[PDB]
Design a protein around this ligand. Structure first.
Ligand SMILES: COc1nc2ccc([C@](O)(c3ccc(Cl)cc3)c3cncn3C)cc2c(Cl)c1Cc1ccc(-n2cccn2)cc1
Length: 223
């Protein structure tokens, strides 16, 4: 891959993300700044466990269909076979939604945007899984410390999808060829404007998988 192809690949990844960002950063920080009142937070707490999972699953499902639209717009993804297309999405689509919900978590007050205002993990007590909500708050609190830009998570969410390990993979080599073209493209745009020590950390590994636990599996039952 030549020099100018990497620059055209980097441009296409952020081009796909800016169209599939779903909420656009600007309004997320614009409503920092609008926090649920004490009467409003109890209204969400007062909802039944079924009522709140039915809302959260609708949020989760609608956020994944943007991730697929993100995946369908990458330069190179559609060139893989559709067997590899599903199996990369099945494994990764939920993993990037957490990485995308990094946007609209506010590390100043430890709150998260949800349906118009900013809440905090006591907003989601109706799910009955405070251990899972607390630990995704910990995940987003770690991402916010790196001060991720818009084009930076565009590349990063693409590398979470394009993983050439996984289970299945008919054209395993064709995945590695696209993965290599994106991870060098990630380090190229990174070397420009000198942000080289957000790479030395970048978790270690495995915690991104650990929070896709047995609470958010199947989950068809909800309307
Ligand atoms: C941290 O708790 C949450 N934070 C959220 C923050 C934002 C949004 C979001 O949908 C949104 C989604 C994507 C982008 Cl880019 C922007 C906004 C949204 C808010 N307002 C409008 N929208 C569209 C939903 C959240 C949800 Cl559902 C939860 C609960 C929850 C979290 C995780 C799991 N889970 C499942 C598997 C593992 N864990 C279950 C339930």
């Amino acid at each position: 891959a030549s020099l100018t192809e990497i620059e055209h690949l980097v441009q296409s990844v952020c081009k796909s993300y800016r169209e599939t960002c779903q909420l656009r950063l600007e309004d997320l920080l614009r409503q920092r700044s609008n926090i649920f009142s004490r009467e409003e937070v109890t209204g969400y707490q007062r909802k039944s466990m079924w009522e709140m999972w039915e809302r959260c699953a609708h949020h989760l499902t609608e956020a994944i269909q943007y991730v697929v639209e993100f995946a369908k717009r990458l330069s190179g993804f559609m060139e893989l076979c559709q067997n590899d297309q599903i199996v990369l999405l099945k494994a990764g689509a939920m993993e990037v939604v957490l990485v995308r919900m990094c946007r609209a978590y506010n590390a100043d007050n430890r709150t998260v945007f949800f349906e118009g205002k900013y809440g905090g993990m006591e907003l989601f007590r109706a799910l009955g899984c405070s251990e899972l909500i607390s630990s995704i708050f910990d995940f987003s609190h770690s991402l916010s410390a790196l001060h991720f830009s818009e084009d930076e998570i565009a590349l990063y969410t693409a590398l979470v999808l394009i993983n050439a390990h996984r289970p299945g993979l008919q054209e395993k080599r064709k995945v590695e060829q696209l993965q290599y073209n994106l991870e060098l493209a990630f380090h190229h745009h990174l070397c420009k404007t000198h942000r080289q020590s957000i790479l030395a950390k970048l978790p270690p590994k495995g915690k991104l998988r650990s929070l896709c636990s047995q609470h958010v599996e199947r989950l068809q039952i909800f309307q």
